[PDB]
Design a protein around this nucleic acid. Structure first.
Ligand SMILES: [Cl-]
Ligand SMILES: [Cl-]
Ligand SMILES: [Mg+2]
Ligand SMILES: [Mg+2]
Ligand SMILES: [Mg+2]
Ligand SMILES: [Mg+2]
Ligand SMILES: [Mg+2]
Ligand SMILES: [Mg+2]
Ligand SMILES: [Mg+2]
Ligand SMILES: [Mg+2]
Ligand SMILES: [Mg+2]
Ligand code: NA
Ligand code: NA
Ligand code: NA
Ligand code: NA
Ligand code: NA
Ligand code: NA
Lengths: 140, 156, 186, 154, 95
RNA sequence: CCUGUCAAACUCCAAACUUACAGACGCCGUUUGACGCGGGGAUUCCGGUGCGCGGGGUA
RNA sequence: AGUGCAAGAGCAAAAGAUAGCUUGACAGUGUUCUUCCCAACGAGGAACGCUGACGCGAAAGCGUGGUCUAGCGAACCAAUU
RNA sequence: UUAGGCGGCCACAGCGGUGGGGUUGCCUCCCGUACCCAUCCCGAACACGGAAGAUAAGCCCACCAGCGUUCCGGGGAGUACUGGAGUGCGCGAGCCUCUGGGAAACCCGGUUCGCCGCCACC
């Protein structure tokens, strides 16, 4: 049963929501791989009328690249609880989000016969705190 | 202007406010009278039943309702009874007020289409039918001949 | 689901199995379809025709019943794909089928992909299929060379027990060779 | 098998109704025809329901009418037992009549005009402004109902 | 009519019931008919091409050859004979 | 939750009915030639009323 | 939601969005419907072909301008190819 | 069909939920990036190569009707409406009779948790 039910880290997105950049450089070193532009939608008063327009970057880290990052990120954070997803996720911080899920997630991310993950097989906020807290730190 | 000009249900239903503007406001003051705080928990229930499909201008609805409720003060401003006029004047009515050239009239009012046998009013009273009298006065101000019907009330 | 007005996709679209827009385009040719499908461990190749109550498969080949002819290697690879195509292609010919269009279902038209390998095989079997040569693999990769060289960077057998340690793109030739004459079910 | 009698004229009656009567071989008031009870025939008689009188007649009545108002496809000739015997498959009027009623044959099949041109009802009919159930003479009749009319128009 | 375009008064006939909404099945857009076959003309709201003038919706013609993939159906408009160019998507076999 | 009402330019529903094609019966046509084809000659393009369904209009 | 603009309709592995590439908004000639129900009538419009040349795509295939219904103009005369 | 591939009808198949299933064979999750191929950044996906592990997802199998849907019984209802007819009624609006058709809402009880085709296969 377990082993295929036990949480794991799938991607950690580090993005800097600026409003118009030079910031990519730090993201590349803080993570270890090229950042991606962040175009915006809708015309708005914050002199942000441009539809297609660089206004921040992000970086999606997977596997070791994600751990080796969290092995310093997490420490720089305190928070927990309430600040957690209903799906077992949490964002802290410059933003650093951590997407958590169980083994058979590809079923919902593949092209052929894809399917949505059953609520039961989903990851709860609780089952999430446990996994992470059980990896170099404390909850609340 | 006379009821003669609008009491018949011969024209098409004309009620789409999305295509009609300048509709006068209804003169009907309220639809729920009496103790509206309480629910129909009364022994007796009389109803005023219209006997012929007709159109009833909001004019007549108001006069009919006032004349009935204004009288239902044989029971007191805070008496124990509830009165309800279930119909609303949806049908918009016009007048061609040039002669018969470009005659589609301009909105002048509204009316409620009632089909023979429907009840336009319903009152709820304890064995104290002063209401039966409030209606002899109500159907006095509406086009049709009417039937004062009592439902829960085998207390004759 | 929500109400009377709710629109529920066709079953095969719910199941995320059939691309109906592509299917119509495919059926336009009025020719038989060469259904190229894959599995983590196998590769299937069918020749389907249109029917009153659904499609009719007139000829097929599965990477599994490949061994039935002397295959002693894995079946989820390039050489496997090609041979299954050729195998289905031949049974196809036997069935009186001369041409077909390449249906790769939900797969991607990536160059040198297994589906195209399947296509190459079916074509060599004798089947006339609309294609484009420089989207196919360069023969060697079809033989299984990319895997042999990959095992050259050995230190540990690419194949857990299986057959050979250094693998055999030659085993590939022996088989293709076999399929090109006589034998049962062909 | 029902007996059909047109009791209302053509003036002002729907054309598609008139054409139905005409398809049923009746082209004048008081003219009568015998029609099998089938789905096809049923719809036709229903369409014509308001300008006609119909019902199943008794063996006797049909015989009386047959004898009194039957005619050859062409000519004056009286259709009597002898005529019937020397010209049809049957031996006498009764035999023909039973055949018609049991819908085994038709006036044409036996060389007879499909139409029985009756006489105005002796004593008059019950009116052409109301159906039978209302005291009139239109619509489906009783076997006893039809007989009376037929006999009065013998 | 206040206008006289081909789609005048076609709100109903060229509209799908909410549930039949969305791309239609390809099976019927590929059906093949033979010359002489009777076919019912009915536009498919979901299929833009291969259409015929809305007025002919409901007609039952006779397939008499084809043009391209489209078919040529003969129908009689009132008392006039007419040839309609229409694709399988909008046809059905009679009986 | 409870409770009071509506739609020519609303529709989860939905007739009667109108209609395409086909078969059946009927009627009709093969000396009264129908269905149809080609040609000659018009008149006609102020209409009106009843009934059903209407749209406008106090009428 | 979006799809240039009325209104009604069509559209979700798209007819929408993003990216890239491309010029089929191509020349020639027809079939049919429409304009004008039935039922004759021009310009115009559309649908669907073919011949030729191309674009894209692995390919089936799609592209006869914009998802569909408005955005149009005779003879004579001029300029133009 | 002890799990598969392509489909037809396109909710009777949707939504939600329960239980069961892989010892050599299948589907998967799964493991892994030298290659073909790939991410405006990530072998996530796509693609390729592969079995250490698992039946927890998916999937297949058995089942539940609470919601949504399809069809049926009984009731609503031969009601509403309506094709044909009337020297029937009504000041009129309109109604009635005969004849031929015939609904919707809703309630109560059943049904429905897909059916079928081709191919492959201890
Ligand atoms: Cl596949
Ligand atoms: Cl057309
Ligand atoms: Mg004679
Ligand atoms: Mg006398
Ligand atoms: Mg009389
Ligand atoms: Mg309409
Ligand atoms: Mg009509
Ligand atoms: Mg177009
Ligand atoms: Mg001039
Ligand atoms: Mg010029
Ligand atoms: Mg399980
Ligand atoms: Na004037
Ligand atoms: Na009165
Ligand atoms: Na559709
Ligand atoms: Na033209
Ligand atoms: Na960019
Ligand atoms: Na499982």
């Amino acid at each position: 049963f377990h082993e295929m039910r036990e949480p794991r880290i799938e991607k950690v997105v580090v993005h800097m929501g600026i409003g118009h950049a030079n910031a990519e450089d730090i993201l590349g070193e803080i993570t270890g791989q090229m950042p991606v532009r962040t175009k915006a939608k809708r015309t708005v008063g914050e002199f942000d009328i441009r539809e297609g327009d660089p206004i921040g970057a992000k970086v999606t880290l997977r596997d070791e690249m994600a751990e080796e990052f969290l092995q310093t990120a997490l420490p720089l954070a305190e928070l927990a609880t309430s600040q957690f997803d209903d799906t077992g996720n949490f964002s802290f911080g410059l933003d650093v989000t951590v997407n958590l899920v169980r083994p058979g997630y590809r079923v919902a991310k593949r092209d052929k016969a894809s399917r949505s993950i059953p609520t039961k097989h989903r990851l709860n906020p609780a089952d999430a705190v446990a996994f992470i807290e059980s990896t170099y730190d404390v909850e609340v | 202007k006379p009821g003669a000009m609008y009491r018949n249900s011969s024209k098409p239903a004309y009620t789409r406010r999305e295509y009609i503007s300048g509709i006068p406001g209804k003169k009907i003051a309220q639809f729920d009278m009496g103790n509206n705080g309480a629910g129909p928990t009364y022994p007796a229930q009389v109803e005023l039943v219209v006997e012929k499909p007709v159109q009833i201008r909001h004019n007549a609805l108001e006069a009919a309702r006032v004349a009935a409720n204004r009288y239902v003060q044989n029971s007191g401003a805070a008496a124990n009874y509830k009165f309800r006029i279930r119909k609303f004047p949806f049908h918009v009515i016009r007048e061609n007020k040039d002669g018969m050239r470009a005659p589609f009239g301009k909105p002048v009012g509204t009316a409620a289409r009632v089909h023979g046998a429907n009840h336009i009013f319903i009152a709820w009273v304890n064995p104290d039918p002063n209401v039966e009298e409030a209606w002899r006065r109500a159907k006095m101000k509406v086009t049709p001949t009417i039937n004062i019907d009592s439902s829960p009330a085998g207390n004759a | 689901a929500t109400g009377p007005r709710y629109k529920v996709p066709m079953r095969r679209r719910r199941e995320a199995r059939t691309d109906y827009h592509q299917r119509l385009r495919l059926l336009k040719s009025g020719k038989p379809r060469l259904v190229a499908r894959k599995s983590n461990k196998h590769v299937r190749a069918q020749l389907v025709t249109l029917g009153p109550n659904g499609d009719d498969t007139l000829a097929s080949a599965h990477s599994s019943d490949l061994a039935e002819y002397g295959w002693e290697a894995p079946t989820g690879n390039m050489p496997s794909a090609y041979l299954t195509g050729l195998l289905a292609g031949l049974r196809a010919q036997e069935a009186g089928v001369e041409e077909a269009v390449l249906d790769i279902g939900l797969n991607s038209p990536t160059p040198g992909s297994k589906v195209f390998a399947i296509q190459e095989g079916a074509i060599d079997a004798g089947l006339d299929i609309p294609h484009n040569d420089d989207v196919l693999a360069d023969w060697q990769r079809t033989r299984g060379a990319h895997i042999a060289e990959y095992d050259e960077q050995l230190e540990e057998p690419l194949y857990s027990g299986d057959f050979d340690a250094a693998d055999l793109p030659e085993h590939f030739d022996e088989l293709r060779e076999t399929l090109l004459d006589g034998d049962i079910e062909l | 098998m029902h007996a059909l009698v047109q009791l209302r004229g053509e003036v002002n009656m729907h054309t598609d109704i008139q054409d139905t009567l005409e398809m049923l071989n009746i082209h004048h008031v008081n003219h009568c025809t015998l029609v099998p009870e089938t789905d096809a025939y049923r719809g036709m008689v229903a369409k014509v329901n308001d300008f006609v009188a119909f019902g199943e007649p008794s063996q006797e009545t049909l015989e009386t009418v047959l004898a009194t108002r039957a005619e050859p496809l062409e000519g004056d000739a009286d259709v009597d037992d002898e005529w019937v015997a020397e010209h049809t498959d049957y031996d006498d009027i009764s035999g023909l009549a039973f055949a018609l009623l049991s819908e085994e044959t038709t006036l044409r099949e036996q060389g007879l005009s499909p139409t029985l041109r009756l006489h105005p009802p002796r004593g008059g009919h019950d009116g052409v402004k109301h159906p039978v159930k209302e005291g009139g003479q239109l619509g489906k009749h009783d076997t006893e109902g039809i007989d009376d009319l037929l006999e009065a128009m013998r | 009519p206040s206008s006289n375009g081909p789609l005048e008064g076609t709100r109903g006939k060229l509209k799908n019931k909410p549930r039949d909404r969305g791309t239609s099945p390809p099976q019927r857009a590929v059906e093949e008919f033979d010359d002489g076959e009777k076919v019912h003309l009915k536009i498919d709201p979901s299929v833009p091409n291969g259409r015929f003038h809305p007025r002919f919706d409901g007609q039952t013609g006779t397939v008499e050859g084809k043009q391209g993939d489209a078919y040529k159906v003969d129908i009689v408009d009132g008392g006039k004979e007419k040839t309609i160019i229409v694709t399988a998507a909008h046809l059905r076999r009679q009986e």
